[PDB]
Structures are given as structure tokens and as C-alpha cells.
């Protein structure tokens, strides 16, 4: 049969019945997507920071 193809009528009512959320950011994002050279050094630049912190407290 002939049918109504497409409409976006009533689509923003459903989009706001459950209240659109911004994506809930965090401190310390994932290092996926970073330049792998920078992440590789950052493993060591934070390992040695912990060694210089844990030995200095004890």
C-alpha cells in the first residue's frame, strides 16, 4: 500500500521525556586516542613520580 514515508514529528517529545544528558565527564580521561609516543613516556613520568613519592614518605 501507499504509506507515509518519513516524519520527525513527535521525535523531540520522546527525546526530552527522559531528559538529554551531557556525557558525564571525569577527571583522568582514558589515554586511548592519545599520541602513543606521549603515552609511552607518560607511563614512566608517573612511575618515577610514585617512586619519588613513596620513598620520601615511607
Partner 1 sequence: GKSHGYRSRTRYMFQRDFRKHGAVHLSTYLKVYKVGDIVDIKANGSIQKGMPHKFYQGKTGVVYNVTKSSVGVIINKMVGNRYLEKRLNLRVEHIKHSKCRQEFLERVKANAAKRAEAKAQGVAVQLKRQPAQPRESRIVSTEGNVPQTLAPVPYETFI
Give residues in contact with partner 1 (CB under 8 A).
14-16, 18, 20-23, 29, 33-35, 38
> If binding is defined by CB under 7 A, does position 17 make contact with RNA?
no
H/E element, 55:
helix 36-57
H/E element, 31:
none
Output 13 or 57, the one with its CB closest to RNA.
13
> If binding is defined by CB under 7 A, does position 25 make contact with RNA?
no
In the bound complex, what is the minimum distance in angstroms from residue 6's beta carbon to RNA?
Answer: 5
The answer to whether 31 and 39 have CB atoms below 8 angstroms apart is: yes
Cell numbers 521525535 correspond to what residue? 11
Amino acid at each position: 500500500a501507499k504509506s507515509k514515508n518519513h516524519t520527525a514529528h513527535n521525535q523531540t517529545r520522546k527525546a526530552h521525556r527522559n531528559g538529554i544528558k551531557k556525557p558525564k565527564t571525569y577527571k583522568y580521561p582514558s589515554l586511548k586516542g592519545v599520541d602513543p609516543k606521549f603515552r609511552r613516556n607518560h607511563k614512566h613520568a608517573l612511575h618515577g613520580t610514585a617512586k619519588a613519592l613513596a620513598a620520601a614518605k615511607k
